[PDB]
Amino acid sequence: TGLAEDGAKSVYERLKNDRAPYETRAQNCAQYTIPSLFPKDSDNASTDYQTPWQAVGARGLNNLASKLMLALFPMQTWMRLTISEYEAKQLLSDPDGLAKVDEGLSMVERIIMNYIESNSYRVTLFEALKQLVVAGNVLLYLPEPEGSNYNPMKLYRLSSYVVQRDAFGNVLQMVTRDQIAFGALPEDIRKAVEGQGGEKKADETIDVYTHIYLDEDSGEYLRYEEVEGMEVQGSDGTYPKEACPYIPIRMVRLDGESYGRSYIEEYLGDLRSLENLQEAIVKMSMISSKVIGLVNPAGITQPRRLTKAQTGDFVTGRPEDISFLQLEKQADFTVAKAVSDAIEARLSFAFMLNSAVQRTGERVTAEEIRYVASELEDTLGGVYSILSQELQLPLVRVLLKQLQATQQIPELPKEAVEPTISGRGQDLDKLERCVTAWAALAPMRDDPDINLAMIKLRIANAIGIDTSGILLTEEQKQQKMAQQSMQMGMDNGAAALAQGMAAQATASPEAMAAAADSVGLQPGI
Amino acid sequence: TGLAEDGAKSVYERLKNDRAPYETRAQNCAQYTIPSLFPKDSDN
């Protein structure tokens, strides 16, 4: 049908004239740091990428993309599923069932970490974080599993997608551009391309578009793929608003523009000035590198004898005729060096590398004083804080849906939500701290006055551990007092009759021969 | 049979003109680090 917005190949073309501000920023912004990261895409093989004269942008990007990956995504359990605790108390008989629910929530949070690591999501997120530094603005598509086989996720680094969003935060429509070759197309698309007509080469590429527009009269998204034809008839997906496999990530958020900025465009002016120094220092060393022999032409020394002489010949002439053209700028090389060492000093804090070689340095700064490296962690804490909303939560809310449909996860009952805690964490440390406070109460087990039954509740109240699996309740002890007794009942009892039977089993020796026959032993002993 | 793509000796020759960007990069790129690692292969 007409499908209320048309056409998807032209929605990409109307809004391709909106990437061109951000795209020509990133082509400039990758030129100074690392040119292989975001090409101009009027680029082929060959177009060799000249290294920038400065190597701080190449340094301070890998040292910032990895320190985001190490901080956003540690190897352990970076998400956790909080059940709403008061609504968990109502629907359940306390207290054993409550932690039994949290074992099912500890079940799921390990399966996702066994799903993320076993599908190389760590790879394509690190390729995402390098795009988020240089350009921002990457959407990565999480396809349906269709089995327990290998399932990566494809990203699109702003030269292959288009989104359009509001001045308000929500997304209106997305267009992604593939260039899948004809032999490599999926099976339903090859029926549509052949259904369009005309034979194709095995290696000819096809601009395959998607269109993920927000629906008329319903809050969910509609998603249809297309070719040069209208649709592909495997198209329509009813993606809900909160769970769509296409999520556009965003380095630093700015309203109400459609895309996001990047982090390293906020220092791209400063790299532009630091390369212009480092271009000049190197070129001053190249005039230096040339060795010109200035012969004083009012002198005696002809170098017709200086060249053709051997290892140690005696030659005519004065030494003060032969001087060499040397590069001047002794007091000028230090001006351009001390500024370039000051600009690298104030970019090395902007990026998360430590203060390092590029000074005298001269540390004596020792030894507990380098806890001010935590100032780099706090400055790092301001960097990804936007990104934990934009990437880190929608990547879980998609995987909580897609694993329900493929039955690789239990259907969690509509009430559990997740924070991206940088990981408990709070459940471990608050349990570990109240143990040591209760361990100080150990010499008070014989004190007749202190209510140790209450102090252990007060520390469990001061430290915010919950309660009610925390202490033995009213009944709960007559069972426990019996178990020490039933132990000593079974212990003294089994030691009684075994001494009781075997003493009288062998006395008046005819009974000893009768006792051995019951086991089946003949008269051996 | 015809095997739907032909011939394999010419698929190598059509696309040998696509290595020549990367190949002449690596011949330059090994020249500066260690020249024994990637020869020009007009080399004996």
Closest CA to A139 of A119, A150, A124, A149: A124
Do A112 and A403 form a contact (C-beta atoms < 8 A)?
Answer: yes
- For A213, phi then psi, to 5°, come to -65, 155
Out of B4, B5, B25, closest to residue A46 by CB: B25
Closest CA to A33 of A5, A50, A52: A52
Q: How far apart are CA A429 and CA A427, in angstroms?
A: 6
Q: How far apart are CA A43 and CA A381, in angstroms?
A: 36
CB contact under 8 A, A45 and B18: yes
What region does A393 belong to: left with phi over 0, alpha with psi -120 to 50, or beta? alpha
CA atoms within 13 A on the CB side of A464: 2
SS3 for A183?
A: coil
Q: For testing the chain B interface, which of A43, A44, A46, A49 should be mutated: the one with the most B CBs within 10 Å?
A: A46
Taking each continuous run of H as one helix and of E as one strand, the counts in chain B are 2, 0
Question: ω into residue A204 within 30 of 0, thus cis?
Answer: no
Give the closest-approach CA distance of B15 to chain A in angstroms: 12
What are the strands, taking DSSP E only, across A129-239? 139-141, 154-156, 161-165, 171-181, 205-211, 221-226, 237-239
DSSP state of A383: H
- One-letter amino acid of B29: C
Structure tokens of A141?
A: 């598509």
Q: Which residues does chain A have within 8 Å of residue B32's beta carbon, measured at their own beta carbons?
A: none
User: Measured in Å, how far apart are chain B's first and last C-alpha atoms?
Assistant: 39
Method for this entry: cryo-EM
Q: Which residues does chain B have within 8 Å of residue A202's beta carbon, measured at their own beta carbons?
A: 4-5
Q: Which residues does chain B have within 8 Å of residue A45's beta carbon, measured at their own beta carbons?
A: 18, 21-22
Give the closest-approach CA distance of A230 to chain B in angstroms: 29
Closest CA to A81 of A423, A428, A388: A423
SS3 for A409?
A: coil
Closest CA to A340 of A281, A399, A412, A259: A281
Out of B4, B5, B22, closest to residue A45 by CB: B22
For residue A319, what are the CA distances in angstroms to A105, A313, A316, A369?
87, 15, 10, 56
Do A216 and A235 form a contact (C-beta atoms < 8 A)?
Answer: no
Give the closest-approach CA distance of A46 to chain B in angstroms: 5
Q: How far apart are CA A264 and CA A396, in angstroms?
A: 27
Interior CA angle at A56 toward A50 and A61, to 5°?
A: 90
- For A247, phi then psi, to 5°, come to -125, 125
- For A438, phi then psi, to 5°, come to -75, -25
Nearest CA in chain A to B19: A45
Strands of the sheet with A237-239, listed across from one edge: A161-165, A171-181, A205-211, A221-226, A237-239
Interior CA angle at A20 toward A17 and A23, to 5°?
A: 145
Q: How far apart are CA A19 and CA A156, in angstroms?
A: 13
Q: How far apart are CA A244 and CA A254, in angstroms?
A: 22
Structure tokens of A242?
A: 């909160």
Structure tokens of A412?
A: 């969690």
Structure tokens of A446?
A: 């014989």
| Residues in B lying within 8 Å of A, measured between beta carbons | 4-5, 18, 21-22, 24-25
Give the closest-approach CA distance of B40 to chain A in angstroms: 17
